[PDB]
Symmetry: D2
Subunit: 189 residues, 4 copies
């Protein structure tokens, strides 16, 4: 009933969103990789920018995601630099480095997702945020998920998202933010 | 029940929004004039920018408005330059100049408003657009309203908004866009 | 000695710049048309933005030009909107429309050019501006040059740049701005 | 001959720049602290942005400095985030944390400075960059200078800038970048 483009060519993000989409939404990947300067100070600003840039180009409803790992004891690092930090290195190398940063520090953290819908015909924009609170593990565990998953333990669990990646579908920042978005869209469309 | 700041110090805009607010919303003017570079290509982009800048500063829910006159035969001019065009001149001078531009041209036009709500605590942003279609009068008539009102005739009428300013409350771009916003907020908050 | 790309495919700008380039500089139009959102409030900001985006992509020295017509009695219009104003219409139609706007007004104006050099390897950026003062003619005359040239008469002359395009090399905003830029470069290279 | 405002109240930058300024230039810290969103991906973009915003407001020539520490094995971190990284913590804590990140890694680094002059009356903008190559020490040493100075050892020396701050005037990124800028200015003023 509604076909919507995603404003990301990140395969892990497309998979994760497709698997929680409502029965009434056909989610397609953008058929063009569009350049976006992601220079927002916050996830919301980057999610909105991407949504707007893709929507103006495609002239069709789009959704975007800007997301990140926030470690409270490190001033919220890496945050909006989650991908850009050590971007030519593997996530395993990034996690080993961040584990060294946290020696002697409080390990509380969150993954945060800002999910944005833009219809460029009507000029309706809806952006909502959600998060999964947790803590950084003391070592990397598992190879499931992607990115920082193998050292993030969600609230309520003792295993990392690398160890129990199936739980992302229920409790991740992305699943929660996009379900929050879908709920709004069900009300207003 | 909800106190919301407006992200505009324009007195005419504050009046117009206050008079259509729902009984559950207390609308206050921003207690600080905040500088915003309005460099968006579209009303939506400027409405979002203002909402975000004020919201991040005030740390409290805000709404913004970016609005303009769009004349189809003049490529949509003045559009986002509605205020900036001849800004040191009176609106009477602006209208006399635009009347000369339109000699021999189709007079169809619209006022367009993008109304944006941002809650910077939750990071929820909602933006919606609406419009009042009409035509440019052949001369300036009346002193009601503000800005280009005295030469804009809405669809369904033969008088300008300068002549019948009371109708803005029912049919203007601003009344319609903000009511559309309020409707969404009633559903999701 | 120095090959430089120009951040425009506007053939008139290319020709105009090539015709005053010093013997030590080879000028090439950019072989890739790079998208830049030209949202600067001034010619300098748009010129810098173009230089930086193009240089970052090309990884080679570039120059950029942002130029426009500034009519003082119209608050500086069209200014940075010189191209975007009625962009789907011919400059002939844009001039006819502007002539109607100017009836009864002061007719003084200037063309303004901001010329920018950027070397992305060294991270050296140099931007200089110049202008040619004049007046708007009562009618369009000549087909020489480009853009608004056929209704702009430079001080010291009674013919438009449409009529005397050969004089642009000597007196235009673009010739003066670029010569100023090349002078700087000659000193510091 | 020329009075110039500096677009910073950082007293160390002020002192450092004043101590190498030529006899013909009077440097004044900006008497108004002007808000700039420093969202550039590079030092040059942030330096230019600051120069332009401050100059537009002050309506007088200004210079700006955007500088940072670039550690190559950390993908160039902290880079443009040099200040923003753990901004609520002391540089001592930031250095301790970075030391932990670097355990077992290549320890090469550079300080980089982009120095920009802007004359808003003429619309002349000049930006030049320089750097000092070095390595990160195994421990924090000295309290001289500012920021990351106490764990950065410039090539040719065995002491940190914390230990030998007097040498910054001669060899630092900021001294070289500004001297390069003043050389240009001496030629073209």
């Amino acid at each position: 009933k509604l076909t919507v483009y995603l404003a990301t060519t990140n395969p892990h993000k497309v998979e994760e969103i497709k698997m929680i989409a409502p029965e009434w939404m056909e989610i397609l990947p953008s058929p063009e990789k569009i350049e976006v300067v992601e220079d927002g100070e916050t996830f919301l600003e980057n999610s909105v920018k991407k949504a707007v840039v893709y929507g103006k180009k495609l002239k069709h409803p789009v959704m975007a995601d800007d997301s990140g790992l926030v470690i409270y004891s490190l001033g919220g690092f890496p945050g909006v630099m989650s991908a850009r930090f050590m971007e030519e290195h593997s996530y395993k190398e990034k996690m080993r480095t961040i584990l060294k940063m946290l020696e002697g520090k409080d390990r509380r953290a969150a993954f945060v997702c800002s999910a944005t819908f833009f219809d460029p015909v009507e000029n309706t924009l809806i952006s909502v945020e959600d998060r999964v609170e947790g803590r950084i593990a003391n070592e990397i565990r598992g190879t499931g998920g992607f990115g920082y998953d193998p050292f993030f333990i969600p609230d309520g669990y003792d295993k990392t998202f690398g160890e129990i990646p199936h739980l992302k579908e229920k409790i991740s920042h992305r699943s929660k933010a996009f379900r929050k978005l879908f709920s709004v869209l069900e009300k207003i469309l």
